Amino acid sequence: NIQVVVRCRPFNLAERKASAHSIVECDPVRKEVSVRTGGLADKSSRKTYTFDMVFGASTKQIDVYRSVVCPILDEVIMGYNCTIFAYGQTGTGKTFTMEGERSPNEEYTWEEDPLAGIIPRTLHQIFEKLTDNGTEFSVKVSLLEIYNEELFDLLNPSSDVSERLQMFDDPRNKRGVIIKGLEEITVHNKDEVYQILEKGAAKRTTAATLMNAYSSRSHSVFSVTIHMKETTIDGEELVKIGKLNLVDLAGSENNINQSLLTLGRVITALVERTPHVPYRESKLTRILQDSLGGRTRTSIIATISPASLNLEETLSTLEYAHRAKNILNKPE
């Protein structure tokens, strides 16, 4: 089965000032999320769901990274392909989890910032893990985004954001795709990481000015490819190639998002064991086909809100994530 975990965000200043009370309780021991759905103080109804891990509102980024990402990175380094999705309502912390933010007032360098998310920590950690173990390696990254079923490259320095890319089937791979023109940027060392991310964020701002509600309607796929070579005591070369996809999905909230609709239908087909799985009906599912019932090791981080206002979308996210637990992949 694929791994599914839930992370609740903390209340913001607005909500605190209103003296909001959380409707979500996370029990990491029981690995349970419980949501208050109705009823007064002294008596209530709840809905409860069990996941692979649960992370309550006070969970820090480093603890998400250690619990979830560390083991996945180790499998990437062994030469497996892995994907982590963030799924949930706009405003629940998909981008916070996958990217993170900067601590205010230049308190930290990027490497040491506690608010850093999965992407920067991962890139930083690859260089640390492979520092002097006998494995020669290179790291390449791309950042592809999908908005209104069009493809954009958020790292090509010499293309304007608005040039769409074209996708084709990869002839040497049944079910693989080729994305014509997608830039892969070589990351030569840890000191090259930040400015690469910065250039991405700058292209994203241009995108947002151009395309309506870009940040909530777009899907983004940040790919890290690690090409590895070991030499044995007899001078034989051993090759390993690991790929990690870190995906920040469109907001799940209730205009037409074909890729998000098709993801849900792919999940349904897989869990119901329907023989036709509709991968080909969107760009997102064609690109990530191998992550959904394929040979990639997959995790989903489902993000939720503590706030009573968000009750129905929270329940929808939890039901969707709980169903996805039944997806079966066959890694390597």
Ligand SMILES: Nc1ncnc2c1ncn2[C@@H]1O[C@H](COP(=O)(O)OP(=O)(O)O)[C@@H](O)[C@H]1O
């Ligand atoms: N775990 C968290 N810790 C601190 N702040 C968070 C957390 N999750 C979300 N936030 C804050 O909540 C807001 C929405 O998060 P964001 O990542 O933009 O959500 P999404 O991508 O799901 O719309 C941002 O202001 C972010 O800083």
Ligand SMILES: O=C1CCCC2=C1[C@H](c1cccc(O)c1)NC(=S)N2
């Ligand atoms: O905060 C920014 C601004 C520049 C672009 C960017 C981010 C975050 C990030 C990167 C490194 C360290 C962080 O604390 C946050 N995460 C990503 S993936 N990119």
Ligand SMILES: [Mg+2]
């Ligand atoms: Mg976001």
